[PDB]
């Protein structure tokens, strides 16, 4: 069981950093007319 | 190029104008938390209790210390009239000062003095009002800090006695504490910060917000935006409300489980109580009744083979048998005495209940926050007679409303600003149509 | 049907007197009813108590008796178990505990009179409804 | 070129025949997480003791039930509204009695489902699209949250979320209308009017652009075959449409304007809906419908019935049937 | 140059409200449904019917108040003013519950009118009659609630009484009694209101999404010109958008606007056959294998033998007073009740 | 575009409002009295506050004939008398 | 020139006469006592 729980919060924490540092990665910019 | 229906968002790049509609608002605002005081305490009557008459802001001063004794008795009505005229009397100066600067005001500030005036991409002049705003806060978070410890006290439902007013000499300012409550779970048992349950905790984290906010309000003063928040961002008025409707939305859902669950900044002597303080006493009423006929509670096997009266949880603690079993995170001033370190302890309950404790759950039970929309008190099956609903169910349903849709607002607000920003708002150019130059998905 | 001097004609004492209300202080026992009692009383029920109700044969078979004025009035003024044996003002709303009931202080006598001028003449119009529950309502 | 800007590329790229972005890095794992234990579930979970009375109900099928009453059942009553993932049982074993699977299915659906709202979004973003499609669905998405979180929050409990399955459905819909007066509630009211005024408008508009096609075709093949992907020209006559309606009331009731005619189509259903969630959501704190029980009586005072009496009644059955081993006192007060 | 033609012509001018010749059965019908409705629930009772106060005038409001069926007593008698049970007389026509078969037959006869309309206007401009055809789906709900449903049963008593609480209990009583949520062609009839709520939105907001820059300003609404051949939003945007969103998306507008006619239509037609079922008794009311296993095995439950506890309940509640002339008589020990409530 | 009057040069006129400055509050009272008068009860058969019930009874009077329905509910009333 | 008695002149008196009559009985009601 403790072992799942580890996995668990290591797996979520990932994609969590995944999604606010793909979001800080110029996303404003990411569109077809005019980026900055 | 808007129509009548948006014509609001024609002040966007009209300084003055728009710091008027902020001002004749702000006035909106202290009008009706005047009005409302002077109009409660038009129809206040002491020989009932607050909540079963409707009232929602002389709770909030009655909490703060004012005109409240020991228990919730209501001593002396100036300080509600006092709140009522003093706020009703500025809305008229917020008043003034709106129509003057919507009207005759110049339109645009940044011609007449380079102060006042401001435009949206100037990220450093933004922040700089985003400082001063801070420091504001902070001010008052601390009045509350002030108040509770050199003009008075608060009203502490948890004093000895049936509760009281009480002078916060010790604010807890250990961190762990202060910030252990933002890492508590939000669920069941844990509460996160709904469930603060003691004056020197609350009067504590205020201390605290307020040297962040005047900390954090002279850094951004002093400071311009770094580029990774620079590129992360959209810098116009429309992305600045929107990131504003967003947090006051997150803001509202929290204060309707502010009001629904806590019973200390939202005193029960005040507001009535919680759904699971109501629950808890209906057992609390019935196990009295049937031990005073000679029940012997503790042994009592239920329909269901578990205890009529007395269960234990999934950890154990001995608790309130029935569907009031979901509610046994309640702590309240009237129960807490008879619980012992394995919960509620057999030996208080055949011996120490007080005619006190017996009074306060037959009155908590009947006046459980059920009630219909045209205010007929209890379950929906039950007939006209008694008039009340809960100021719980009045505040938890009308911010979940409120916060729902500024929610919709900052989702609505928030797409139009990116849309703008890159400059397709106002639907696509025909002889570029990004998707005709991408390639075919098959 | 309409409330007429025999509907609201109830008993006094149990001597057998009779007092008959006017409409006027009937309105005004239901108005104090709802105000002070219907709480824990609506429909004639008690919920904070199922098996004791406001029905006329329950007061009758009361001790005291309280299917009358005298009883009702002196009930709502220093209030007794069923039997009669312990007195409660300490945990039901009376007179001689307005001080931690505190509806109970504006209350005048004429105001009781027609608080138990309700109760009587109630269960005379709604029948087996008035302490029947929601199986009647 | 460097290895994460490569990655953010893909990500974000328009050319995915399935669109991913940052939302969809959090909703495909989540999503597909409480797809497969509801798929599961369904089908071979063991009986679950719901209302934590030691009275397990039987959902999947292996247990004997068929699509129509097989249910994921939510939560014991006696976890309330703790947290209960695997981790915090003693076993699998203890997991599925006291009914585990329901909070994992919902809270993952929950997540993946407001990404799949910003998700929306994002690829009107990326394709340089006006944003709020994503506006219209959190119509829907507001009321999964209604049902499946605000109001088990109000009433203490996930016992009280709506169950994944058909008759637990309408189970969890007859004791709200014993319990909260719902038909007589004005938001699920104007939810009715919303969603009756969509399938009405729905049909309306679809009956009067198919009444205008302009002839493009012969007897012997599909009037859909007149119009042609990525035509410029529109392939009805919207004046001709706007004749007929016009004349059908009158004039001025009818639209000539397409964008006004389409924005009303959204802005009908999405509001009305809205409410009910509202409905949903408000009635979470027992903020009931009206109650006119006994609101009418004679000169003697006589109650008089009207048919809300007799809703009542029927209400009262429900009342006092629903969990019929689960109360020991007098009142049902969550 | 007959007098016929003369008619013909003045009735199809063109004029504020057209007229027509399916004016002559619609307008005087369609008007007196209504006054019929607003003079009753302003006005009538149903004391002597149903027990029940049920007008403006009695106490009721707005959503209390009701034009109610007729006593059971009445059988499916057309209660007619000048039929031999009101036998001319306006007062007793109307405390017999007269004015409800008069809503409904003139109701009945308008909705023709109405149909009939779409036809003669159609006819007129020339176009398809696709908006009369669709009006079939209410037509059929109309006429399989409010006349085929009570002809079934023992009397008009049994269809909606026309009200807002009113037709409430009558959504009640098909639960109780026959477990109407359990039957298919609801469930059809309920994935056609909500699919077609659905394809309205989703439809209304994708074309506001994907619309052409046609003005310079803020108010896309001024950009639209009612007469021009061009397309207005994008369906290639769209049709993108959607596959990568959904995965599928649609390609031909035309069969578009026709599933936005086809999925309502058809969901209100499933739904008059399953009330023309229950107009008989013919409920899909149980499953056979499960009541075989719960009989022998008192620990086998689902959420199927615990709706039919609740149905069992709102039966035995309800009945004596939604049915006052059966004189149902439950003691209080009869009645079903759990533990405690 | 139909060659009748238009409606917002009908009620911004003189006339209109001279003719239903007058002939609005008629039609208002008018209804008042039919409710004020009584006339409203007798027309349509309604119960009167008064005559739901007979002073002791708590039946209700149920029509339960179809042929004598008539005379049925003209016995409640002399009940009633 | 225009007409002041049209068919849409009737239309309007056949829903608006009744209307402001039936508010003025259901004003009437709400003095109505028991
Ligand atoms: C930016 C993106 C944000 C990312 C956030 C993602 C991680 C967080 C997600 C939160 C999930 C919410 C679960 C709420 C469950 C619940 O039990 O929540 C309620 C809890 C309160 O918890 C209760 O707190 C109580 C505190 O009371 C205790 O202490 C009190 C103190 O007096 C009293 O003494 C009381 O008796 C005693 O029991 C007890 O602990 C209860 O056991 C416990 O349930 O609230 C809370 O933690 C406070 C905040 C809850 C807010 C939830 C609102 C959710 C609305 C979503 C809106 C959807 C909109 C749809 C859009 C379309
Ligand atoms: C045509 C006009 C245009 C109308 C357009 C549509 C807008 C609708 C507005 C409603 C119209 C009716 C208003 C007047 C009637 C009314 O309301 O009348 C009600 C009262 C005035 O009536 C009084 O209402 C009172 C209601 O009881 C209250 O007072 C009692 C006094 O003991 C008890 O304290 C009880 O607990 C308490 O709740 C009493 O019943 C009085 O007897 C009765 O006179 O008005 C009030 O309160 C005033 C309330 C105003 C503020 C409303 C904000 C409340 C926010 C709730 C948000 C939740 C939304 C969820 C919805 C789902
Ligand atoms: C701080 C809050 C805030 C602020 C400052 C703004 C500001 C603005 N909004 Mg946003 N908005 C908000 C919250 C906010 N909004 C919320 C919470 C939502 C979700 C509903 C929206 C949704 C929204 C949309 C959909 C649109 C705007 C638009 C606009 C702009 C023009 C608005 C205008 O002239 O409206 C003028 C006001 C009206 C026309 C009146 C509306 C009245 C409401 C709907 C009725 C409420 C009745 C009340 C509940 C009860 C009545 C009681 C009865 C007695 C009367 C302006 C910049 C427009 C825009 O994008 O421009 C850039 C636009 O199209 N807003
Ligand atoms: C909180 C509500 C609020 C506020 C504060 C404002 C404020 C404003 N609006 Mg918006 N507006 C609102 C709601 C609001 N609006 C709503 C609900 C709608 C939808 C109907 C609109 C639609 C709208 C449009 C369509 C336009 C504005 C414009 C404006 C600005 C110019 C007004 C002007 O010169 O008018 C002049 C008005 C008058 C001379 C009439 C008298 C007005 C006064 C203020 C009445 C005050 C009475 C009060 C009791 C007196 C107290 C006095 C005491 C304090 C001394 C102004 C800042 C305009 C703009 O941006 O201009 C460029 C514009 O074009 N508004
Ligand atoms: C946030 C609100 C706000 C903002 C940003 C402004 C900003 C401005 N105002 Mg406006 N104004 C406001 C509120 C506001 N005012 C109010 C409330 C009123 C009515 C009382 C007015 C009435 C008003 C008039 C009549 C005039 C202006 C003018 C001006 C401009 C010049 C001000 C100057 O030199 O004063 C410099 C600074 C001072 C004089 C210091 C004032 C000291 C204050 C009162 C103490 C602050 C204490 C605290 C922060 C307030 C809260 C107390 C409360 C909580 C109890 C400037 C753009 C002038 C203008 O543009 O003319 C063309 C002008 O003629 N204002
Ligand atoms: C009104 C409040 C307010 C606002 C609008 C801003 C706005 C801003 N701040 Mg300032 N700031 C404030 C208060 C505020 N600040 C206060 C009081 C302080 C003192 C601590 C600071 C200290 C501060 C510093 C030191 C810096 C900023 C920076 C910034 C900018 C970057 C924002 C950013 O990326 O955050 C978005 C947030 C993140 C990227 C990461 C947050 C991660 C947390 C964990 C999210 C948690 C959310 C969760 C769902 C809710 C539960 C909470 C949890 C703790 C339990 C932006 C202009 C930066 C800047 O450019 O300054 C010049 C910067 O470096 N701020
Ligand atoms: C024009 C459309 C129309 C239609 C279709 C109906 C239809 C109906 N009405 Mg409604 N009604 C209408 C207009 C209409 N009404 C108008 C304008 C009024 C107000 C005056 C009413 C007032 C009204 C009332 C008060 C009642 C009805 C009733 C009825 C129903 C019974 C009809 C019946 O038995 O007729 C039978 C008779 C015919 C169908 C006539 C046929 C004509 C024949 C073919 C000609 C005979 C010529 C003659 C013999 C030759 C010369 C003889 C010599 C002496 C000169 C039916 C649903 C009743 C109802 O709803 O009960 C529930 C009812 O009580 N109607
Ligand atoms: C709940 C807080 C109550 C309120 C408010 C009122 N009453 Fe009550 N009543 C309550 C209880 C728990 C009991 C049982 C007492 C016992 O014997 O243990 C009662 C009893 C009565 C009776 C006696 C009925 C009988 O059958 O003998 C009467 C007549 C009565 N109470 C009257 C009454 C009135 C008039 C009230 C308002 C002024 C009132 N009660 C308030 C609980 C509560
Ligand atoms: C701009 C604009 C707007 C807005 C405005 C506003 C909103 C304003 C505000 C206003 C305000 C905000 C006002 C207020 C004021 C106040 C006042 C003026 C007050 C008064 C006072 C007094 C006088 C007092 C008295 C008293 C006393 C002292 C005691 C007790 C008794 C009494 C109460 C009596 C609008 C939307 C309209 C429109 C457009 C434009
Ligand atoms: C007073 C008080 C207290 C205290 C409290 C406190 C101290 C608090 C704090 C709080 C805080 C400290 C908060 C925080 C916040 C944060 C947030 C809320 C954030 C958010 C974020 C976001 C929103 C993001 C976004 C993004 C991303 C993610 C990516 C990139 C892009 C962007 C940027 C957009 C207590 C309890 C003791 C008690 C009572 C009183
Ligand atoms: C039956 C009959 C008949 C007929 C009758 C009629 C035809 C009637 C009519 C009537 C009518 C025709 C009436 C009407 C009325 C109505 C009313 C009653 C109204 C009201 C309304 C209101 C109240 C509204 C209001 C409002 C609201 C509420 C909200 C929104 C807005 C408004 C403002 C709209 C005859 C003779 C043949 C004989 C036989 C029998
Ligand atoms: O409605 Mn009736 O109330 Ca809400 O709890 Mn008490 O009973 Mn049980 O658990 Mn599901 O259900
Ligand atoms: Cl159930
Ligand atoms: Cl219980
Ligand atoms: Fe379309």
Same mark, same amino acid.
């Given at each position: ?36 | ?378 379950? +929906? ?14 505040? +938890? ?46 | ?15 057998? =007197? ?6 006027? *202080? ?7 009813? *709802? ?50 044996? *312990? ?46 529950? =929601?199986?009647?309502? | ?31 597909? /997480? ?26 999947? @099928? ?27 049982? /003693? ?54 949250? /209604? ?16 169950? @994944? ?74 004046? #001709? /449409? ?23 189509? #959204? ?19 027992? @903020? ?47 | ?103 409904? $037959? ?12 779409? !036809? ?47 037709? !409430? ?91 936005? $006619? ?80 | ?81 | ?34």
């Amino acid at each position: 069981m403790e072992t799942l729980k580890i996995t668990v919060y290591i797996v979520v924490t990932f994609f969590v950093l995944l999604f606010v540092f793909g979001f800080l990665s110029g996303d404003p910019a990411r569109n077809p007319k005019r980026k900055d | 190029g808007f129509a009548w229906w948006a014509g609001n968002a024609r002040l966007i790049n009209l300084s003055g104008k728009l710091l008027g509609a902020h001002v004749a608002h702000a006035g909106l605002i202290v009008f009706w938390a005047g009005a409302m005081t002077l109009f409660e305490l038009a129809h206040f009557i002491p020989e009932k209790p607050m909540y079963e008459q409707g009232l929602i802001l002389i709770p909030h001063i009655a909490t703060l210390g004012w005109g409240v004794g020991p228990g919730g008795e209501v001593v002396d009505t100036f300080p509600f009239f006092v709140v009522g005229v003093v706020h009703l009397i500025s809305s008229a100066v917020l008043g003034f000062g709106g129509v003057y600067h919507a009207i005759r005001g110049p339109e645009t500030l940044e011609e007449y003095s380079s102060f006042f005036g401001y435009d949206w991409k100037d990220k450093n002049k933004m922040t700089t009002i985003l400082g001063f705003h801070l420091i504001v806060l902070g001010i008052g978070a601390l009045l509350l800090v002030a108040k509770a410890m050199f003009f008075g006290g608060l009203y502490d439902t948890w004093a000895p006695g049936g509760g009281d007013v009480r002078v916060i000499t010790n604010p807890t300012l250990d961190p762990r504490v202060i910030f252990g409550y933002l890492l508590k779970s939000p669920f069941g048992g844990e509460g996160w910060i709904v469930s603060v349950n003691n004056l020197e905790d609350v009067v504590g984290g205020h201390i605290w917000i307020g040297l962040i906010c005047i900390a954090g309000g002279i850094w951004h003063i002093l400071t311009t935006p770094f580029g990774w928040a620079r590129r992360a961002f959209i810098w116009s008025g429309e992305a600045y409300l929107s990131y504003s409707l967003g947090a006051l939305s997150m803001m509202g859902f929290i204060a309707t489980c502010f009001v629904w669950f806590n019973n200390t900044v939202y005193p029960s002597e005040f507001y009535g109580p919680t759904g699971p303080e109501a629950s808890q006493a209906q057992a609390m009423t019935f196990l009295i009744r049937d031990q005073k006929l000679g029940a012997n509670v503790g042994s009592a096997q239920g329909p269901t083979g578990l205890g009529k009266y007395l269960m234990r949880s999934p950890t154990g603690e001995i608790i309130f048998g029935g569907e009031t079993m979901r509610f046994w995170d309640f702590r309240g001033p009237w129960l807490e005495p008879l619980r012992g370190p394995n919960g509620l302890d057999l030996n208080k309950i055949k011996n120490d209940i007080q005619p006190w404790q017996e009074r306060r759950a037959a009155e908590y039970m009947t006046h459980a926050p059920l009630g219909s929309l045209n205010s007929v008190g209890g379950v +929906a099956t039950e007939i006209n007679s008694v008039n009340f609903v809960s100021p719980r169910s009045w505040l +938890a349903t009308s911010h979940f409303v409120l916060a729902f849709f500024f929610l919709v607002g900052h989702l609505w607000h928030a797409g139009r600003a990116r849309a703008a920003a890159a400059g397709f708002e106002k639907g696509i150019d025909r002889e570029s149509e990004p998707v005709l130059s991408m390639p075919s998905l098959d | 049907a309409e409330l007429t001097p025999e509907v609201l004609t109830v008993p006094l004492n149990s001597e057998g =007197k009779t007092i008959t209300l006017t409409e006027k *202080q009937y309105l005004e026992g239901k108005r104090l009813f *709802q105000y002070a009692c219907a709480s824990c009383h609506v429909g004639g029920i008690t919920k904070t108590n199922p098996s004791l109700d406001l029905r006329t044969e329950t007061l009758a078979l009361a001790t005291p008796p309280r299917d009358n004025i005298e009883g009702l009035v002196d009930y709502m003024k220093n209030p007794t178990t069923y039997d009669g044996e *312990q007195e409660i003002a300490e945990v039901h709303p009376s007179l001689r505990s307005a001080d931690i009931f505190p509806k109970m202080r504006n209350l005048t006598e004429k105001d009781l009179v027609a608080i138990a001028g309700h109760i009587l003449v109630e269960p005379k119009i709604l029948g087996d409804k008035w302490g029947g529950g =929601k199986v009647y309502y | 070129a460097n290895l994460w800007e490569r990655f953010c590329n893909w990500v974000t790229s328009t050319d995915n025949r399935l669109y991913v972005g940052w939302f969809g890095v959090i909703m495909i794992p989540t999503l597909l /997480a409480a797809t497969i234990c509801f798929v599961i579930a369904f089908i071979a979970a063991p009986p679950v003791d719901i209302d934590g009375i030691r009275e397990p109900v039987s959902g999947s @099928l292996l247990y004997g039930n068929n699509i129509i009453t097989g249910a994921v059942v939510p939560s014991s009553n006696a976890i309330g509204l703790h947290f209960y993932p695997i981790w915090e049982a /003693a076993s699998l074993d203890e997991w599925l009695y006291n009914g585990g699977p329901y909070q994992l299915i919902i809270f993952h659906f929950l997540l993946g489902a407001s990404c799949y709202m910003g998700r929306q979004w994002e690829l009107s973003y990326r394709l340089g699209m006006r944003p709020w499609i994503c506006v219209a669905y959190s119509a829907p998405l507001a009321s999964a949250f /209604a049902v499946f979180l605000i109001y088990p929050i109000g009433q203490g409990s996930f016992s009280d979320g709506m169950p @994944l399955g058909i008759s637990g459905t309408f189970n969890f819909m007859i004791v709200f209308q014993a319990e909260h007066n719902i038909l007589m509630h004005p938001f699920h009211q104007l939810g009715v009017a919303g969603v009756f005024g969509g399938a009405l408008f729905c049909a309306m508009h679809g009956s009067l652009v198919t009444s205008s096609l302009i002839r493009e075709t012969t007897e012997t093949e599909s009037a859909n075959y007149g119009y042609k992907f990525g035509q410029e020209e529109e392939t009805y006559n919207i004046v #001709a /449409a706007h004749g007929y309606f016009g004349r059908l009331i009158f004039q001025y009731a009818s639209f000539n304007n397409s964008r006004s005619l389409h924005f009303f189509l #959204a802005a009908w259903p999405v509001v009305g809906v809205w409410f009910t969630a509202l409905g949903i959501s408000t009635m979470a704190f027992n @903020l009931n419908g009206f109650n006119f029980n006994h609101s009418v009586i004679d000169a003697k005072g006589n109650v008089i019935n009207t048919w809300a009496d007799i809703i009542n009644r029927a209400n009262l059955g429900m009342e006092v049937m629903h969990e019929r081993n689960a109360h020991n006192f007098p009142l049902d007060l969550a | 140059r007959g007098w016929f033609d003369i008619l013909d012509d003045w009735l199809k001018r063109d004029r504020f409200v057209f007229v027509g010749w399916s004016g002559i059965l619609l307008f005087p019908c369609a008007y007196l449904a209504l006054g019929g409705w607003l003079t009753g629930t302003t006005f009538v009772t149903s004391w002597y019917t149903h027990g029940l106060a049920s007008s403006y005038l009695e106490g009721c409001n707005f959503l209390t108040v009701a034009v109610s069926t007729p006593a059971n007593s009445m059988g499916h008698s057309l209660l007619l003013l000048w039929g031999p049970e009101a036998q001319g007389d306006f007062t007793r026509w109307c405390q017999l519950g007269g004015l409800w078969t008069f809503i409904a $037959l003139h109701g009945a006869f308008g909705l023709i009118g109405f149909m009939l309309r779409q !036809f003669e206007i159609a006819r007129l401009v020339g176009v398809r009659p696709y908006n009369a055809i669709a009006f079939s789906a209410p037509i059929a709900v109309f006429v399989s609630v409010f006349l085929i449903y009570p002809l079934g049963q023992s009397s008009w008593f049994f269809a909606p009484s026309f009200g807002v609480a009113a037709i !409430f209990r009558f959504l009640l009583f098909f639960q109780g009694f026959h477990n109407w949520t359990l039957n298919p062609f609801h469930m059809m009839g309920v994935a056609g209101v909500l699919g077609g709520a659905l394809l309205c939105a989703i439809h209304g907001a994708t074309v506001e999404n994907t619309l052409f820059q046609d003005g310079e300003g803020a108010s896309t609404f001024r950009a639209f010109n009612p007469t021009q051949a061009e397309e207005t939003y994008s369906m290639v945007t769209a049709n993108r958008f959607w596959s990568q969103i959904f995965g599928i998306a649609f390609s031909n507008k035309r069969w578009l606007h026709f599933f936005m $006619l086809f999925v309502p239509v058809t969901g209100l037609w499933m739904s008059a056959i399953g009330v023309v079922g229950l107009a008989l008794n013919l409920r899909s009311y149980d499953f056979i294998s499960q009541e075989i296993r719960a009989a022998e095995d008192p620990e086998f439950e689902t959420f199927y033998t615990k709706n039919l506890l609740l149905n069992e309940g709102i039966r035995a509640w309800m009945a004596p007073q939604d049915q006052p002339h059966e004189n149902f008589v439950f003691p209080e020990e009869v009645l079903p009740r759990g533990n405690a409530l | 575009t139909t060659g009748e009057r238009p409606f917002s040069d009908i009620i911004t006129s003189v006339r209109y409002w001279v003719i239903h400055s007058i002939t609005i509050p008629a039609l208002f009272i008018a209804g008042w009295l039919f409710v004020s008068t009584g006339l409203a009860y007798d027309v349509f058969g309604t119960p009167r506050p008064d005559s739901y019930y007979a002073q002791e009874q708590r039946s209700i009077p149920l029509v339960t004939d179809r042929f004598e329905a008539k005379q049925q509910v003209e016995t409640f009333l002399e009940q009633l008398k | 020139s225009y007409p002041i008695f049209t068919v849409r002149w009737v239309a309007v008196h056949t829903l608006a006469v009744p209307t402001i009559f039936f508010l003025g009985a259901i004003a009437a009601m709400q003095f109505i006592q028991r």
